[PDB]
Amino acid sequence: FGRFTERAQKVLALAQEEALRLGHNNIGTEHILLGLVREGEGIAAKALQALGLGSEKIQKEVESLIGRGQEMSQTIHYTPRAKKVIELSMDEARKLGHSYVGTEHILLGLIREGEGVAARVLNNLGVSLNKARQQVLQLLGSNETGSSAAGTNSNANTPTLDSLARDLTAIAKEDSLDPVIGRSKEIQRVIEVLSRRTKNNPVLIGEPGVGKTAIAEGLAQQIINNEVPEILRDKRVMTLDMGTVVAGTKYRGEFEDRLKKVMDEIRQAGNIILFIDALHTLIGAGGAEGAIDASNILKPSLARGELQCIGATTLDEYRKYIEKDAALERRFQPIQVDQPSVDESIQILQGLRDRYEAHHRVSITDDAIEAAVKLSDRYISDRFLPDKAIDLIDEAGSKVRLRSFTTPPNLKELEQKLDEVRKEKDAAVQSQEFEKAASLRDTEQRLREQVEDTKKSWKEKQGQENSEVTVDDIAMVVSSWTAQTETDKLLNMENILHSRVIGQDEAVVAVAKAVRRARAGLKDPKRPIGSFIFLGPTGVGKTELARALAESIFGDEESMIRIDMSEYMEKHSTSRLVGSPPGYVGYDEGGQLTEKVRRKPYSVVLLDAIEKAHPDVFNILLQVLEDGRLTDSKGRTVDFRNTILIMTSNVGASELKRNKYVGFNVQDETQNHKDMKDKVMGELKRAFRPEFINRIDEIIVFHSLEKKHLTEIVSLMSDQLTKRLKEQDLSIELTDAAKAKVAEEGVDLEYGARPLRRAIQKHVEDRLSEELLRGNIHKGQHIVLDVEDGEFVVKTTA
Amino acid sequence: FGRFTERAQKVLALAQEEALRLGHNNIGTEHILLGLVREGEGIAAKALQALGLGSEKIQKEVESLIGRGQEMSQTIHYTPRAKKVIELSMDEARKLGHSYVGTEHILLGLIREGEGVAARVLNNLGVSLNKARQQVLQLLGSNETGSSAAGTNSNANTPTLDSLARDLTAIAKEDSLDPVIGRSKEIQRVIEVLSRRTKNNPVLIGEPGVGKTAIAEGLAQQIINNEVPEILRDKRVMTLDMGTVVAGTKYRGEFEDRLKKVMDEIRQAGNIILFIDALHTLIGAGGAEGAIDASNILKPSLARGELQCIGATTLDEYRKYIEKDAALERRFQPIQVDQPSVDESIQILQGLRDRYEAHHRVSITDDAIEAAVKLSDRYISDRFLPDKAIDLIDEAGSKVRLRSFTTPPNLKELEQKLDEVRKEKDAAVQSQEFEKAASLRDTEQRLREQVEDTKKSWKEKQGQENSEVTVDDIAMVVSSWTAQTETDKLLNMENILHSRVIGQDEAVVAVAKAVRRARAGLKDPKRPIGSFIFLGPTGVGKTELARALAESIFGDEESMIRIDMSEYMEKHSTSRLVGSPPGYVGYDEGGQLTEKVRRKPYSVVLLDAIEKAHPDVFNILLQVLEDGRLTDSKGRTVDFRNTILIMTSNVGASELKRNKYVGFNVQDETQNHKDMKDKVMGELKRAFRPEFINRIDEIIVFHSLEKKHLTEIVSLMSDQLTKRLKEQDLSIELTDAAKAKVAEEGVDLEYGARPLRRAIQKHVEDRLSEELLRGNIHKGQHIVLDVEDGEFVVKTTA
């Protein structure tokens, strides 16, 4: 463990004393034994002395074994035996509780480690090996705390508390309990519901979930001192443990008998508080089958206020309790439960910081902690508000410890050397090559010790790293699943969205800033952190931006939903379909849209082409744009809170598409920019509603296939070519000159970014592949796509 | 076998020594026995010396049996008795461990082989048979290699580490464990989670289905060399396996008890790591029923980081564990896992080459590994990227070893000869035929030995064949199952695609090259290896190519899906074919398209008539064409990555029936052709979106055909005709003259190579059948359909 108590460590160290004092150059097990008895009256020492083995008998034997007197010690270390006695005692102290290790455990461990020299010393001195282990054991000394033993007696208190179960108050009066951080404000509202007896019973309804039980520990504590009513005179709080009841009975009838028995002993009534966890399950109300029907005893118990109790139920479970009534409802009574808010989250993190010292990789920083919470809270969100957080802390709370030993100065090389030695050595001893092996051992064990020395020279790499969890550290980890490298994502959002997305710098910056505005909590984020209309012809920058947003906001690109509203049809297909039209919009509301965004809570919902794609859909989406929610799928609420709603359009497209390229225009270009930033968003308005648009964060125009925007679409598609072939092993690069020649062919006033795929396909994919067919390039060489003089040329550079 | 130790073999060989030295024509068991005791102090020998059976006692009995004087010792081999002892001992040493037979096993085996000459020698010399077999056994301490035995240590470690389990770490120190190749990049992020305390649990989410258990070996190894974190410098890695828990238990209550005890023993805390496969199952993993509700113990165990544990969870199941919280979600952490890419595949294969040395058509070649891998990985594809591969390697890695012994010069005939002998002899001995039986044995056993001598002369046919597993070998086998004779299929694709699309050489060569382009790693395999539209009139080469491509790429024609998009038009066939097919394109997405192509992954998706199929179809096809995926059927991903999208269409019909016809002019023909490969592809654009067409890899017109090309379509139809009649034994052949007469019909602007089917039907099946009925020809005659003076005449050539 490396955390041992003195008594152990001292008897062990006393061995080393005998090592040199007798010369035994490896500190033997005989010396560990001497160690016990020469340490006088530790439990080990004492023990041996009980059986009659004083220091006198032991050293007399010991000196007659290895004895004299080469006072040094060889690398002053132990015998392997003696090292075993230390390992053993540690476990012999685990067994006997003891987190650390005490004297006894060393003698106990000696007996255990019985081929050791000590063992034989004692078996020579007339005392059986087991007589020695006996003595130590029966003087059971180990680490202690959590005292609650001093003798106790009562009469009637016996029947209740036996069964079933732990007493929450008890564990909080010896404080082996911890607060734990709630869910504090809930507790006051419970004591209102509890210092009752006309409806005696609190019943907590809500998500369970971070630990319902935190509220419960609340009650215990407040019921003792002193804000507790005299309504609640001389109360005791006792907790239900379902697990003990079911265990050892293995039948429902027996289980019922035990619960019945408990209800009877509750006859101490009007002075008792019962905590019933999962209170509905016992009542057994509703469903196809019940849920366990303890209810026969439990229901009248609840009514009487003898089982004046606190019920911990769940969202559906309360329904299934008032469903019985009026004693499972005229006793029962629901209460609004807390699950920790964002600020509470931060506090929890820190609260368990100090136990992360056990792994030594966080404690600190606060700033990082905040990140854990906040960045996660707003951007995915795949856990609850504090759970998300803590996971990030620890995630980063290891991350740097990995970079520690991946790169110290890399005495990883040291170990690498030591390897080569052993081999040489080994095989040399085997080859003979004998004295040529000699030196090979010596070089080996030299190395071994050096190796071990420089890996604990990276205890300096520990005192450097072994507890922080920094801003960036947490933030990067927050990006890995999902302040610094999530808020650097936020601050540098424009930069990040541009680096994947096209020459529609107008569009990128508008979206970037609009999301970054909301996502930093200064603009309405109850509804998407950006609602948008993305105008432009398809493949221009629109989709690409949806992707880049996912990437920047959440730290992963693949948190992007994508629904085509135009695909929902049969919405006027009365008898036209056949005789009924069962489906598509019904599928979208009733299942698809609501389930999907509920699945990935935050995610770029990319709602394709809603230019005329069921005018009802725009209203449905409007509720998302306003509230951040839709209610469909028979009562599910889908949170589009920090989704990025991107509603696409290609009705403005025509003007967005327009040129800026030379070779054919020099004045239409400087009339295409200015034209697109006004005209596009107005072909939009006719294709939507202003009511829709009013709940949108910003209306984005993707000035496209410019001069400029083209050679960036070409650089996305062509770069996807050069990358998709490397898995199958081909290295492609297009020079800027070759990406340019393709870009000329997607522009004018008319077309889209549609012909760009086809021409990239032709000039890169098809051409290179026809270039493997012509033998200039091959598979797995580097292919530079160049222009020779105005005629295309595929060059090779590998 | 051949897996024998010396001592065994030596006592046995000593038998042969006695064979001639005492003269035993076949050297009895008595000589093996003499062998044992004269080999002195091998365990058999040694044993006999205990029983009192020195060389003295044995040889006196032996010499009184035979003892003299067949000094030649007839073709010096053993007796069947003595041979039995050798066969027996090998296994009598397997039985007692040993894969290499020791002395003991031969004496043990003598007793076993107790009728034997040896056995009887000893039972004559006063030593009971079991007293002897005992003696060897009680002087055989048995093997202790591959293990470590010298004593034990430790106390508390006992209950935990016992249970439960194998311990990969043990086999990874004292090697017996595989590397494995991995799934290496997963391990850093995993070790990150064991360098933590709020997070504690790495939890691997992905297909299980990657050989997840390989990753598990990862930790052990990596915690050793060379990244060593602070708590993972005192961590131990312990494996928990479900299989031992279920066995001998057979009760859920008992199962819970066993787990509770284990979890309790984890009190060695802050020093232990638990590997839990199927971590979700224990938690409850949502659902309509629990998956096991170990969760009660498991959750606090997860939270403290006492049981920092490693979760192997499934796609839905993980969701249903992080939902439980905040200990099955606090500890939890998702991680990105690997299922091998093509390069990784290759490396695994090679690593395990050396053990199908044993399969003697393997180990080697590298190039063969590559063939296996690359061809399966990219082309159908029925497992994971390395599993597919090795089956092909190994297929071939035996295949030629089969050709070894089914084609040497085929000394199988020898055995055939030997048959006639034995019989003749046998029956001759029974009839008598005294000397007529005599000579028959002599011919029999002479022959027999010659056979066997030359069957192991094809150990030269082994020394010839027994490694190598080449490219081509693999490739042919990959075609057998489903990188030379699959990449020769690619390079020579034009020949292969033409041999069924005999006609439209223009079209064929474009497609051939387009797939061959992609499959050689330089085109687009993200998109289908070739997406195409094959334009043409039906029954011209279009469909026929879809098949021929399947054949060439996958080695099988029938890996071809086939969807009519005009049926999934939701307005062409929703109300004149079917009732309510959830609004027909909804049927296609929601079920049909996605299920079909997902079943055979890289199937030729053959999309009929995309002229009109509703504009909704074209978006879906565009996505198939672009991404190489479609996502439908409530979250299924259907892989169109290296599918062959082949879309047929009569879209530009007029040109797709303006053949190559002599009718208008003979200067019209290569002007119907060249014209058709341009004019069609613009009616294509008019009938369906250009955006769709731009992600198509190449737009093929599979021309409408006029002789030249007709008489080659006629020759496909006629060859399909004549061949389906061979199964029921009716042989037809058409002369080239007759294939010409049918082609005149397929001429003109007015039709393609369409009318040809009816006219092959009429002129081959129907005409030959009306001639088979007229007695001009008969069944199973080779039936020549010939032209006389310009009209058919059926000739016979049988």
Side-chain angles (χ1 to χ4, degrees), chain A residues 92 359 391 397-398 577 761, chain B residues 155 195-196 230 574:
Chain A
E92 231 297 306
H359 71 269
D391 277 62
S398 30
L577 199 75
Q761 166 190 315
Chain B
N155 188 177
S195 172
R196 296 184 201 172
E230 183 275 324
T574 199

Side-chain angles (χ1 to χ4, degrees), chain A residues 441-481:
Chain A
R441 177 281 304 236
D442 287 57
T443 54
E444 204 195 325
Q445 201 190 1
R446 267 63 284 155
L447 248 155
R448 286 177 253 164
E449 301 166 304
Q450 201 200 359
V451 153
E452 301 154 18
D453 295 331
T454 56
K455 293 299 95 175
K456 66 183 167 285
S457 185
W458 305 136
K459 296 304 179 176
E460 170 247 55
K461 230 73 207 176
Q462 298 194 359
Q464 286 168 345
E465 163 272 298
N466 274 250
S467 272
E468 49 82 352
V469 89
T470 57
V471 285
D472 64 291
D473 183 23
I474 275 182
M476 64 182 77
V477 301
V478 182
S479 311
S480 306
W481 28 264

Side-chain angles (χ1 to χ4, degrees), chain A residues 182-194 202-208 211-219 222 275 310-313 333-340 344:
Chain A
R183 315 159 166 264
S184 302
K185 52 179 172 293
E186 219 293 291
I187 310 166
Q188 184 281 135
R189 186 71 182 228
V190 172
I191 297 294
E192 310 193 307
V193 196
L194 187 60
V203 181
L204 300 187
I205 176 271
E207 62 184 301
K212 28 181 175 179
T213 56
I215 305 167
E217 299 162 69
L219 302 171
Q222 183 272 357
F275 174 80
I310 297 91
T313 57
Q333 199 272 314
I335 315 183
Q336 34 284 110
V337 174
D338 179 63
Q339 181 270 111
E344 304 177 60

Side-chain angles (χ1 to χ4, degrees), chain A residues 773-796:
Chain A
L773 303 192
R774 285 181 302 259
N776 174 279
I777 67 88
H778 302 81
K779 190 176 192 169
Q781 44 63 257
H782 210 330
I783 296 181
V784 187
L785 285 82
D786 307 74
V787 176
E788 192 174 292
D789 45 67
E791 72 88 61
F792 186 57
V793 63
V794 186
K795 292 188 174 66
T796 296

Side-chain angles (χ1 to χ4, degrees), chain B residues 315-324 326-327:
Chain B
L315 291 72
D316 176 21
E317 313 302 298
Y318 179 59
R319 313 313 306 152
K320 307 187 296 180
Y321 154 83
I322 192 180
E323 76 186 6
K324 305 300 189 302

Side-chain angles (χ1 to χ4, degrees), chain A residues 92 355-356 359-360 391 394-395 397-398 401 412 415 455 466 577 584 724 729 758 761 765, chain B residues 155 192 195-199 226 230-231 233 343 522 524 527 574 586 696-697:
Chain A
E92 231 297 306
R355 63 173 193 92
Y356 306 161
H359 71 269
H360 305 250
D391 277 62
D394 249 299
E395 201 163 60
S398 30
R401 195 139 54 94
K412 305 166 74 70
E415 290 73 76
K455 293 299 95 175
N466 274 250
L577 199 75
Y584 266 134
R724 68 178 66 117
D729 313 297
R758 192 70 185 195
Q761 166 190 315
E765 316 174 355
Chain B
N155 188 177
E192 200 177 300
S195 172
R196 296 184 201 172
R197 278 289 180 271
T198 1
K199 292 277 216 189
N226 209 306
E230 183 275 324
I231 38 162
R233 269 172 177 174
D343 305 297
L522 346 291
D524 210 323
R527 300 198 326 227
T574 199
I696 300 187
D697 292 49

Side-chain angles (χ1 to χ4, degrees), chain A residues 385-435 437-454:
Chain A
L385 292 296
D387 189 66
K388 61 188 51 170
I390 54 179
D391 277 62
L392 301 164
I393 317 168
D394 249 299
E395 201 163 60
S398 30
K399 202 179 227 61
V400 195
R401 195 139 54 94
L402 289 228
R403 315 168 207 170
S404 189
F405 295 107
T406 294
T407 302
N410 303 291
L411 293 167
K412 305 166 74 70
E413 174 274 343
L414 217 70
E415 290 73 76
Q416 267 70 288
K417 303 163 68 188
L418 167 58
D419 186 11
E420 320 312 301
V421 194
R422 203 273 145 73
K423 297 199 289 289
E424 295 162 55
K425 187 282 299 169
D426 191 62
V429 180
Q430 274 64 280
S431 292
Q432 301 179 57
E433 196 72 1
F434 227 156
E435 180 49 53
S439 309
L440 301 175
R441 177 281 304 236
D442 287 57
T443 54
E444 204 195 325
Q445 201 190 1
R446 267 63 284 155
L447 248 155
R448 286 177 253 164
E449 301 166 304
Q450 201 200 359
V451 153
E452 301 154 18
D453 295 331
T454 56

Side-chain angles (χ1 to χ4, degrees), chain A residues 1 84-85 87-88 91-92 94-95 112-113 133 209-210 352 355-356 358-361 382-383 387 390-399 401-403 405-406 411-413 415-416 455-456 458-459 462 466 477 480-481 538 562 564 566-567 569-570 575-578 580 582 584 587 592 717 721 724-725 727-730 753-755 757-758 761-762 764-766 768-770 772-773 777-779 783, chain B residues 152-157 188-189 191-193 195-200 225-233 267-269 271 303-305 318-319 322 324 326-327 333-334 336 341-343 374 378 385 491 513 516-527 570-571 574-575 578-586 589 614 616 619 622-623 626 629 634 691 693-699:
Chain A
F1 192 16
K84 291 294 119 291
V85 186
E87 183 179 61
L88 218 168
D91 308 320
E92 231 297 306
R94 295 298 189 186
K95 166 177 173 289
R112 298 180 82 93
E113 202 279 298
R133 181 183 163 67
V210 175
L352 299 178
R355 63 173 193 92
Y356 306 161
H359 71 269
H360 305 250
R361 221 291 85 204
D382 52 285
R383 287 169 164 103
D387 189 66
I390 54 179
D391 277 62
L392 301 164
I393 317 168
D394 249 299
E395 201 163 60
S398 30
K399 202 179 227 61
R401 195 139 54 94
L402 289 228
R403 315 168 207 170
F405 295 107
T406 294
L411 293 167
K412 305 166 74 70
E413 174 274 343
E415 290 73 76
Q416 267 70 288
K455 293 299 95 175
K456 66 183 167 285
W458 305 136
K459 296 304 179 176
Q462 298 194 359
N466 274 250
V477 301
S480 306
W481 28 264
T538 46
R562 178 178 174 185
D564 181 43
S566 301
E567 193 263 6
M569 301 304 205
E570 68 191 303
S575 195
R576 193 211 60 74
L577 199 75
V578 46
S580 290
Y584 266 134
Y587 301 151
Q592 300 169 279
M717 292 174 181
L721 180 277
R724 68 178 66 117
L725 300 176
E727 192 282 311
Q728 285 290 104
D729 313 297
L730 178 60
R754 336 310 315 121
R757 176 79 291 197
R758 192 70 185 195
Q761 166 190 315
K762 258 55 187 169
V764 193
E765 316 174 355
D766 293 49
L768 293 181
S769 60
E770 280 161 46
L772 173 134
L773 303 192
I777 67 88
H778 302 81
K779 190 176 192 169
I783 296 181
Chain B
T152 54
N153 200 67
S154 303
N155 188 177
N157 290 96
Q188 191 269 359
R189 281 276 289 185
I191 291 285
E192 200 177 300
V193 225
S195 172
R196 296 184 201 172
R197 278 289 180 271
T198 1
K199 292 277 216 189
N200 289 295
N225 194 263
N226 209 306
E227 189 191 275
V228 271
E230 183 275 324
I231 38 162
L232 292 129
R233 269 172 177 174
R267 55 74 161 85
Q268 310 187 131
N271 305 107
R304 212 300 304 173
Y318 179 59
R319 313 313 306 152
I322 192 180
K324 305 300 189 302
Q333 177 242 25
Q336 36 286 134
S341 295
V342 304
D343 305 297
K374 301 292 292 187
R378 72 199 180 202
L385 280 72
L491 275 297
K513 286 182 175 297
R516 169 201 313 196
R517 267 175 235 157
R519 279 273 182 254
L522 346 291
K523 202 197 190 181
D524 210 323
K526 169 186 93 303
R527 300 198 326 227
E570 70 180 301
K571 59 196 178 190
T574 199
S575 202
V578 73
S580 291
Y584 229 152
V585 179
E589 296 308 84
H614 198 306
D616 298 347
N619 190 251
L622 153 73
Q623 286 161 328
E626 186 62 287
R629 56 121 284 274
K634 303 292 185 294
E691 169 172 354
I693 299 164
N694 294 140
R695 280 63 185 174
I696 300 187
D697 292 49
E698 195 173 44
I699 306 298

